[PDB]
Subunit: 250 residues, 6 copies
Amino acid sequence: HNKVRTCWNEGRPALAGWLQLPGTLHAEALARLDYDAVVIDMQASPIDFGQVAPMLIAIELGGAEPFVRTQVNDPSDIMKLLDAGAYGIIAPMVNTRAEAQTLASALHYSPRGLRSFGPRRPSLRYGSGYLAQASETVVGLAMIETREALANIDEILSVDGIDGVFIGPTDLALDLGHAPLVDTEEAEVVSAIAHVRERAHAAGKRVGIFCGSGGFARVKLAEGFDFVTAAPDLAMLSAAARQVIADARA
Amino acid sequence: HNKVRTCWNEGRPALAGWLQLPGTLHAEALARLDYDAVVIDMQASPIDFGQVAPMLIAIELGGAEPFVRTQVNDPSDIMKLLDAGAYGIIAPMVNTRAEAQTLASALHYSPRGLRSFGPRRPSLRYGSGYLAQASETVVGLAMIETREALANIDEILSVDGIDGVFIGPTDLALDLGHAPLVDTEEAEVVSAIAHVRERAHAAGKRVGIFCGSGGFARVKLAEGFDFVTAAPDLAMLSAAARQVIADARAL
Amino acid sequence: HNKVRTCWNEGRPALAGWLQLPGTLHAEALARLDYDAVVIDMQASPIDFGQVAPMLIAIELGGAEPFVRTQVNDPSDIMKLLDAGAYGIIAPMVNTRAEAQTLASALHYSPRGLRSFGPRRPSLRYGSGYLAQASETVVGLAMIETREALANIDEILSVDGIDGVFIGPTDLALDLGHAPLVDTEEAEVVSAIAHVRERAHAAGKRVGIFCGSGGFARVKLAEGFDFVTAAPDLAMLSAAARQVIADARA
Amino acid sequence: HNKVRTCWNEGRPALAGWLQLPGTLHAEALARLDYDAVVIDMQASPIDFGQVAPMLIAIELGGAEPFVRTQVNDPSDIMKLLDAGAYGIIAPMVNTRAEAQTLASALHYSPRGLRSFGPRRPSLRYGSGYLAQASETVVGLAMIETREALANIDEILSVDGIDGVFIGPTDLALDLGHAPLVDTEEAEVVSAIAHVRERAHAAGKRVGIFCGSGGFARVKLAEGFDFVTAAPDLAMLSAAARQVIADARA
Amino acid sequence: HNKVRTCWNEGRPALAGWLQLPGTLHAEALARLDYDAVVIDMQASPIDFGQVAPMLIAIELGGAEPFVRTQVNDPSDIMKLLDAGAYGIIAPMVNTRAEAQTLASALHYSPRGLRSFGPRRPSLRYGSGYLAQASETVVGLAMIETREALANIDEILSVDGIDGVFIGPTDLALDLGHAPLVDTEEAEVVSAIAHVRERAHAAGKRVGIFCGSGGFARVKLAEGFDFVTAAPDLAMLSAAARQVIADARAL
Amino acid sequence: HNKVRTCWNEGRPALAGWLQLPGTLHAEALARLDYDAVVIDMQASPIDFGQVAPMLIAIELGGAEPFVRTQVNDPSDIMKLLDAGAYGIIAPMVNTRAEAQTLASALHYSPRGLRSFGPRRPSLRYGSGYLAQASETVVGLAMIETREALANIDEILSVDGIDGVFIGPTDLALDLGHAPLVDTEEAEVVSAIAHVRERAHAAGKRVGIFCGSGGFARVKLAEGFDFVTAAPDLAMLSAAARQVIADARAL
Ligand SMILES: [Br-]
Ligand SMILES: [Br-]
Ligand SMILES: [Br-]
Ligand SMILES: [Br-]
Ligand SMILES: [Br-]
Ligand SMILES: [Br-]
Ligand SMILES: [K+]
Ligand SMILES: [K+]
Ligand SMILES: [K+]
Ligand SMILES: [K+]
Ligand SMILES: [K+]
Ligand SMILES: [K+]
Ligand SMILES: [Mg+2]
Ligand SMILES: [Mg+2]
Ligand SMILES: [Mg+2]
Ligand SMILES: [Mg+2]
Ligand SMILES: [Mg+2]
Ligand SMILES: [Mg+2]
């Protein structure tokens, strides 16, 4: 079973890791922590497909559901990843109902979508009965990180075949005319985010958000978020080394 | 100029990072911090030659001195790394004078060593007049992490063409019959490390040490070690994540 | 000369291999067998471009025409591959005349198409006279694997600059509302396939099909197919190991 | 600062290298020569993203501004590269004002464009003030290599958010119905190129051109070109080895 | 637990696959079959360290024990593989007791061997209390494929810290002056293999063998070999394809 | 047939290219020129096993004989390259007869050597009846680039199973106390090279040499060297670019 979906079915949210660094060793290492999922970021990173492919295997062995935030909302790229044992897709810059249908169409075999049939790695996981349950095995979120996304939120949330939406808070803050700051106090950004969540849950759909600290993720979890990511590997690693250095040199 | 040798020339220590994770992005980032050097571990890691080459380029662009802890003390492996712009070499399990001579032979052109001439990247960095300073551009440390190497410390320090030694405290604890624990303070191991430190300085040679934490590294800097590494990327990242998860899930 | 095109000119079909596993050693090994071509599958596989590039070289040394089934019908991806010594392109999910023109446009230098000029590997094969013969050196098939493709078959086959079409029988079976089974007996799927072939040959164009067994490929060859692939490396390798195990344990 | 932009601000053109061969050693080596920039060609080459990523680092260490000629004018591919320390983008086959706006939109953060915010490598170069100066740090050229591009030159040059255009002379010669020859004497091709340059400078925008010899680049430099590339690594390497062989065998 | 050592503990053989082809997709797939272990050949293959690391992860996710046949019997190569989650080691051309001691030294922490401590992947799999069972988590086999190794079988079996040996029948045939043919039954070679088998069991040590076919492997299981590999991916794939082509082109 | 051995059989020299740059595109292109062979330098370069494998395939498709200058003279490294379709081996720093014997052992199947049997690519190229000609399909050269190797030239040439030697003039100049300069004509080094050439031919053995330029290579062909390499890709590319830049920026 999909571990995030089994979180949701058992009435609780998922906490996910977020990797910008390529490779299998930190991926597995983080996956064995009390993360329900680890997201590989193929957008704001040097991670291409050759590197993602072994990292999905690493996360699954680690005991976390492999998730990928794609470079772009592209049906054929999303389908390749599904076939490689990506079991969650987060599509950036989903701004319209049409783009969200485009996302949906990639996540589901006909007749519900137009997903190409060749399930190399999921067939090994789920076996010859994969077709029947393929849809439930995969989690699909549209990212909301523009003013336009915000305006089209109900129409995006109308789209059958996506589990929910995922807030890109830095892109969202920037396009709102504010500082691209993670975990921001900026009142407009904060109200926009709360508005996205309320609309999502009213549409009976799931909402997630990207966090830069445990402190902030704790708060989002308390406010009812279903899928919270904290924190990117490079940011935690950078912060950790800065502390090691200041402690060593004090 | 070698950033580590500059520290040493002004009679100050060098502080170095330590990578077990392949990739250029974290190698550049940590290199931009207040690290004098960044060591790529090619031993206890999934980093092979193909991954190491571009990480060297990134650490150098970062503005730290590129260091490698080799898989093994093998002269052909060491030479190929130096030609790929390793300016720092930490050769593991150097247990005998013969083995220090073998390290030494790789770090120096004839007649001082038998290093092969083909310095693809060094000649790009130091241009004309690289050869004239080749030996000083490179830093070479013999790793002490065995009973045998503890016994043979004086003969290892006698070898002209090495700068000094580098302690592996966990592997030394293990080989002295004790728990292989991070930043060990097992009394006997503490004694053996103190002895190595003193014999390095008595010999006019630099002494360095592997640290798993900022606390231990600060104490080693205070004990006058010349080269302190702190801490491995993977151990810093796992602890960082464990803490972010505990704060996220806290009542 | 293109070995598949020289098959066709000499009044006989091509039998091609089908690789989902990355690497050069099996590629060369299979290429030296009595395969006229080996197809690299960049869709239902972890094969990205970094891995495809050496595999094209391996197949050509092996003595088989390097063919690639792309992730997607994309002009710029197809052009890169041509430039890397892909000499056959099979484009998945070609559903409309417009998408088939899009395919055609990538395969041909102006004025016949809008192929970007920079023929890194074909220049080495064919020399400074490559331009004059570039078109004949490359084989272009549109895949037919949807109901929509089926409906638009004559219009697809109308498009100047494609050699023919290639049936995706599992995607085709699935979208027809049937089991995604290779080498299927399902009567609708079988009639649809026979209909695609008849229309193709009536349009004086070539038709191929993907097979999962030698038994089935034999039949398609007999029915007049011009380009038959059997069988994917992973499927033959999986089947072979299952036999080795049952023989060893009997 | 961007070294090409500082060339232009100081009233002089840029001479750039052009790499079709993957890897870091020749990249750094060429970057330390009296090249102001080195362009990595991801179109007419086997260079994918995994190989480009370390080559950008190599060029920057070498002391030349890392430039990339993309496979295709794609917003999400261009954005990934920016984030990887590509500081110049040359987009091939820019044929219309709309495609040039598409290019522009990728190069600039909102509100001037819709660039996704996650500046992994430029943040390390420029620091926390990167946002304010992001636009100036990057150089954007639209390639003109079709008749259609030629026809739409004023409209392309109208687009705010591109520095200028870059002539693809072989594709341009080919589509003009002439031989795809580098550094061509063909009178129509020569007049078209001179016309592109004149229109560019009249629009107060920058113009570049791809060259195959130092002799030709010298001439383009004299005619007022702002960004001249000479010559592709494989072509110089091939020519050099042919000379070595003829000298050795004489 | 080591799936091979579990087979052995219940006094049953282990059956293992054999990969010469790089990639994670076929390594996972074959690992999901009724193979106890899957050996990655890093000797007679284009598989280097960079490709081997993710194949280990895939075989383990597949649910077979990850095994490696090394390029050479070299302790630093063996240690780096064990730390990357090789739980099974087959070291080629082990011809002398000294060479078995050298294999042995890599497979065990001090004081039983001189394995370096840095178990990145093993500590993730076996968590707390890995060190307490480290030796049993790993399986190490000395390869017998020479005249010299045939002569020295008893002294190789005497070495405490190896589980047993692994026969290379083709390389042994070749070195005994005979055609290097797959699953050879050359009378003299058959005698030499039988002798190795008997001296392994007399010594209380496990004995294994390379098979190129399911037929030969079944006979070896019947002769009581403890570890049988069958058959190499590339040889299984070429024969599979040859047969599909012959059926496709048949009248 | 081996293109180098064919040259030799008709008593003509072989001319070879030399790659320090990873990638298949330039390896194919230069192989299509009038080069008899193309040597991949795995020593003074960032080329590891993973990059070397597909470059061999490209040089062979190019229509030149695939050659490798190894990182080190190590039999397991040499064997794995031959099985990956290296048909030409240049082993560096071969200084003693023992070291030539060690090269020799890797190039030949028993009983003439102890090469492991697993010829994945060679058996694809030469099909049935590869084994019958395996030794002649491969060319092996001992590199002379030291004082020691100059002294021991006669005992190195005595070793049956090597074709001859390959001079590294820069490394030989360096080790003889002189400037390590490209295509050196330092009088003493010229003497040492002439002596090596004469002792190779006296011994009935082939002699080859590293050239950094077409001029030097032409002179060596004229002095009757049997194998001349000219010139490294990276040195040819940097000079080519320097010249294109100087012409571009000229008044
Ligand atoms: Br945790
Ligand atoms: Br963050
Ligand atoms: Br066949
Ligand atoms: Br199939
Ligand atoms: Br210059
Ligand atoms: Br050109
Ligand atoms: K977990
Ligand atoms: K620094
Ligand atoms: K064939
Ligand atoms: K420069
Ligand atoms: K299994
Ligand atoms: K040739
Ligand atoms: Mg965003
Ligand atoms: Mg040398
Ligand atoms: Mg399909
Ligand atoms: Mg063009
Ligand atoms: Mg150690
Ligand atoms: Mg063997």
